[PDB]
Design a protein around this ligand. Structure first.
Ligand SMILES: [Cl-]
Ligand SMILES: [Cl-]
Ligand SMILES: [Zn+2]
Ligand SMILES: [Zn+2]
Ligand SMILES: [Zn+2]
Ligand SMILES: [Zn+2]
Ligand SMILES: [Zn+2]
Ligand SMILES: [Zn+2]
Ligand SMILES: [Zn+2]
Ligand SMILES: [Zn+2]
Length: 186
């Protein structure tokens, strides 16, 4: 719970930079950003060694969620431990029922994200694991790339100023499989 832990985590590890909540799941966690994307494989939010590691914002993103595309990722262990419910978004009824997640930043800014796709892709997706590549792609290539890999999708109003947030980890039942749940910042 955020009220007991967030400030203290923030005080303990300057890598701590947001809190993530996804209604309909037990995803309700502090988020770190590392200096690279391997740092939190075997490191906890408190900054110590860990067998499961942590969920992390891509090192190339702005902590303020100002970028076009903010990628929140978990490696294999942390994904199984913390993001085990993401594949529920593959289910029609689940996807139609749970439509948002929210983030609170370290300056206590509150963001609401509107979910529009659940994606099945793999570790070698040419677009979605690089926020820089996304930033320099057109909105239409981004949305069509996503569309063709989506198991669930919904059309929502977008502008060219729209920002996106993706949550992702592995899906160990398919080859090099990755799941992505993506939304648009309210
Ligand atoms: Cl990857
Ligand atoms: Cl874009
Ligand atoms: Zn940093
Ligand atoms: Zn539910
Ligand atoms: Zn660090
Ligand atoms: Zn990994
Ligand atoms: Zn895995
Ligand atoms: Zn607060
Ligand atoms: Zn593509
Ligand atoms: Zn709205």
């Amino acid at each position: 719970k955020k009220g007991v832990q967030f400030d203290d985590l923030l005080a303990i590890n300057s890598d701590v930079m947001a809190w993530l909540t996804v209604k309909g799941t037990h995803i309700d966690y502090p988020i770190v950003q590392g200096e690279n994307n391997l740092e939190y494989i075997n490191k906890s939010v408190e900054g110590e060694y860990s067998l499961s590691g942590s969920v992390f914002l891509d090192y190339r993103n702005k902590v303020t969620f100002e970028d076009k595309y903010s990628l929140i990722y978990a490696h294999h262990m942390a994904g199984n431990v913390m993001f085990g419910e993401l594949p529920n978004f593959r289910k029609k009824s689940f996807f139609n029922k749970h439509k948002e997640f929210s983030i609170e930043t370290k300056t206590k800014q509150k963001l609401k994200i509107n979910i529009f796709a659940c994606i099945q892709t793999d570790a070698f997706d040419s677009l979605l694991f690089n926020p820089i590549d996304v930033d320099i792609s057109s909105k239409n290539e981004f949305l069509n790339h996503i569309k063709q890999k989506s198991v669930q999708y919904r059309e929502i109003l977008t502008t060219n100023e729209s920002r996106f947030v993706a949550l992702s980890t592995c899906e160990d039942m398919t080859t090099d499989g990755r799941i992505i749940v993506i939304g648009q910042i309210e």
